Short mmCIF file of C-alpha atoms in Angstrom, two decimals:
data_model
loop_
_atom_site.label_atom_id
_atom_site.label_comp_id
_atom_site.label_asym_id
_atom_site.label_seq_id
_atom_site.Cartn_x
_atom_site.Cartn_y
_atom_site.Cartn_z
CA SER A 1 -23.65 -2.26 -50.08
CA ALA A 2 -28.04 -1.72 -49.75
CA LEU A 3 -27.09 -2.13 -45.77
CA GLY A 4 -24.83 0.29 -44.04
CA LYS A 5 -26.81 2.28 -41.96
CA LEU A 6 -27.88 -0.79 -40.31
CA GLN A 7 -24.26 -1.95 -39.85
CA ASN A 8 -22.27 0.92 -39.26
CA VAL A 9 -24.98 0.90 -35.59
CA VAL A 10 -23.53 -2.87 -35.16
CA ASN A 11 -19.54 -1.96 -36.03
CA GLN A 12 -20.09 0.88 -32.88
CA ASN A 13 -20.88 -1.20 -30.76
CA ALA A 14 -19.36 -3.35 -31.35
CA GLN A 15 -15.97 -1.18 -31.35
CA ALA A 16 -16.55 1.20 -28.45
CA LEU A 17 -17.13 -1.74 -26.96
CA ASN A 18 -13.66 -3.86 -27.75
CA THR A 19 -11.84 0.17 -26.94
CA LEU A 20 -13.83 -0.65 -23.40
CA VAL A 21 -12.36 -3.97 -23.08
CA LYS A 22 -9.20 -3.38 -24.26
CA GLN A 23 -9.24 -0.13 -22.07
CA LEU A 24 -7.87 -2.67 -18.49
CA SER A 25 -4.37 -3.50 -19.85
CA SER A 26 -3.16 0.27 -19.17
CA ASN A 27 -0.29 1.21 -16.86
CA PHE A 28 -2.10 4.81 -15.95
CA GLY A 29 1.07 4.93 -14.55
CA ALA A 30 1.62 2.08 -12.22
CA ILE A 31 4.55 0.26 -11.95
CA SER A 32 1.88 -2.71 -13.06
CA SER A 33 -1.48 -3.10 -14.81
CA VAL A 34 -3.08 -6.21 -12.75
CA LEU A 35 -3.86 -5.73 -9.52
CA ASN A 36 -3.49 -9.17 -8.10
CA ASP A 37 0.63 -8.66 -8.98
CA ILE A 38 0.48 -5.83 -7.27
CA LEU A 39 -1.25 -7.13 -4.09
CA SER A 40 1.52 -9.62 -4.28
CA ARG A 41 4.62 -7.95 -4.27
CA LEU A 42 4.20 -3.99 -2.16
CA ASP A 43 3.09 -3.13 1.41
CA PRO A 44 -0.39 -2.19 1.46
CA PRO A 45 0.70 0.91 1.79
CA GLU A 46 1.72 1.31 -1.64
CA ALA A 47 0.08 -1.14 -2.36
CA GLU A 48 -2.97 1.38 -2.50
CA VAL A 49 -1.53 4.40 -3.73
CA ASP B 1 1.29 4.46 25.47
CA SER B 2 5.34 3.71 27.17
CA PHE B 3 7.30 1.01 26.96
CA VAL B 4 11.84 1.11 25.94
CA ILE B 5 13.02 -0.37 22.51
CA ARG B 6 15.67 -0.86 20.82
CA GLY B 7 17.49 2.41 19.29
CA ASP B 8 17.01 0.67 15.38
CA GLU B 9 13.13 0.24 15.44
CA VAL B 10 11.50 4.08 16.27
CA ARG B 11 10.98 4.26 13.25
CA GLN B 12 8.87 1.10 12.76
CA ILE B 13 6.19 2.77 15.38
CA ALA B 14 3.97 3.82 12.24
CA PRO B 15 1.28 2.10 10.83
CA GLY B 16 1.33 0.77 7.73
CA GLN B 17 4.96 -0.68 8.45
CA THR B 18 6.41 -4.05 9.36
CA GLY B 19 9.02 -6.31 11.92
CA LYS B 20 9.35 -8.82 14.26
CA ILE B 21 7.96 -6.02 17.02
CA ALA B 22 5.57 -4.19 14.99
CA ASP B 23 3.87 -7.83 14.22
CA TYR B 24 4.67 -9.36 16.99
CA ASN B 25 4.75 -7.10 19.99
CA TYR B 26 2.90 -3.92 19.01
CA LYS B 27 0.39 -3.07 16.08
CA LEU B 28 -0.49 0.13 15.35
CA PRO B 29 -3.72 1.24 13.24
CA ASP B 30 -3.10 2.17 9.36
CA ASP B 31 -5.56 5.04 10.17
CA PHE B 32 -3.71 7.08 13.54
CA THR B 33 -3.78 10.13 14.85
CA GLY B 34 -1.48 11.61 17.18
CA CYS B 35 2.24 12.11 17.60
CA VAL B 36 5.19 10.00 19.10
CA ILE B 37 7.05 10.50 21.34
CA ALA B 38 10.87 8.80 21.64
CA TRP B 39 13.89 9.68 23.46
CA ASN B 40 17.58 8.33 24.47
CA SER B 41 17.92 7.13 27.94
CA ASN B 42 21.09 6.11 28.63
CA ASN B 43 21.68 7.92 31.95
CA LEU B 44 19.06 5.53 33.11
CA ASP B 45 18.73 2.34 31.15
CA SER B 46 21.80 1.14 30.52
CA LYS B 47 24.71 -0.53 32.86
CA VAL B 48 28.13 -1.74 32.62
CA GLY B 49 27.38 -4.87 33.28
#
C-alpha cells in the first residue's frame, strides 16, 4: 500500500479512457446507436437528422 | 422549368425525395432554394378519348 500515489494516476487514466470508449454506445436521442445501421435504414433527409 | 405530370406526383417534387419520376425523370438538388408552382389543367390538358 506504499505506492498508492503512482497507482492513482494509472487508475484515473484507464478509467477516463474506458468512459470515453463506452460513451459510443448511446443513442443521444437517435433511433439507434450505430450509424452504419442508420445509413442503411432511412433516406438521407432524416438520416442526417 | 415547366412540365406536366400526374396528380399524385406533385408532392414528389422536393429535395431529398424518391420516386419513379424523382429518380428516372426529374431530380431536385438537396440544397434547392426557390418556389414551386403547380395548377390543375383539366380544361386544357384533358380529352374524352
